[PDB]
Every structure is written in C-alpha cells, then in structure tokens.
Amino acid sequence: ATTVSNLFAPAADPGAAWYLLDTSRSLKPLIYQERMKPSFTSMTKEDDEQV
Amino acid sequence: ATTVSNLFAPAADPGAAWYLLDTSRSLKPLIYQERMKPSFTSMTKEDDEQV
C-alpha cells in the first residue's frame, strides 16, 4: 500500500515451479462459421445479411 | 404542353440507333433460391412452410 503513488501493478513471478501463474484452461480449439449459403435464413430474408 | 386540362403523354422515339431511348441494365438475371431442404428453418425447423 502506498498513500499517494498508485501508478500500476508491476507483477513478479517465479514461473519455475511445476505450475505457472494464471494457468490457461481450454476445452476445445476455436471454431469458425461462414453462413454464406443461399440456405441461410438471414442472408435470404434479413436484407441479405450474412454473418 | 398547351391549352387546359393536360392530356396523357405519348412519346416519339427512334429505333434505328443501336442505343435506344431507354435501357434496362442488370448485374444478374432472374435467380431463385427455393429452399426444399429438410433442415430449412421454416419447412420443418420452424413451421410447415415451403418457400
């Protein structure tokens, strides 16, 4: 705690143990979508909006 | 325009010129997107509606 100066939060870590700080967790990789076919509802009805 | 009670407006146009007095220009001709698919939203997946 500093009475006046509160600039930022420089962080120091050992990063050498079996684990690391703020470990990341993922279930499955990233998926991408292209609703461009004529069968897509919005791109035929929503003023031809494709997403 | 002359007289009172203005009448309908005929028009005199030549046809010899290959570039006619008017012109209808289009990016694409007629195109159709009949969605006869079992997975289409409104035929089996939102309603019993074929479009």
Interacting residues of A39 by C-beta distance below 8 A, sequence separation 6+ = B33, B35, B37, B39, B40
Report the distance separating Cα B37 and Cα B27, nearest Å: 28
> A17: which DSSP letter?
S
The CA-based dihedral angle spanning residues B24, B27, B30, B34, taken in that order and rounded to the nearest 10 degrees:
-150
Report the distance separating Cα B21 and Cα B11, nearest Å: 11
Q: Is the minimum CB–CB distance between A39 and chain B shorter than 8 Å?
A: yes
Q: What experimental approach yielded this model?
A: cryo-EM
Q: Mind spelling out the 3-state secondary structure of chain B?
A: CCCCCCCCCCCCCCCCCCCCCCCCCCCCCCCCCCCCCCCCHHHHHCCCCCC
User: For residue A38, which of B28, B30, B36, B18 has the smallest C-alpha distance?
Assistant: B36
3-state secondary structure of A3: coil
| CA closest to A41 among chain B residues | B41
Q: Is the minimum CB–CB distance between A48 and chain B shorter than 8 Å?
A: no
Which residues in chain B precede a discontinuity of more than 2.5 Å between C and N? Answer: none
Beta carbons of B42 and B51 less than 8 angstroms apart: yes
Helical H segments across A1-51, by residue range: 41-45
Resolution in A: 2.6
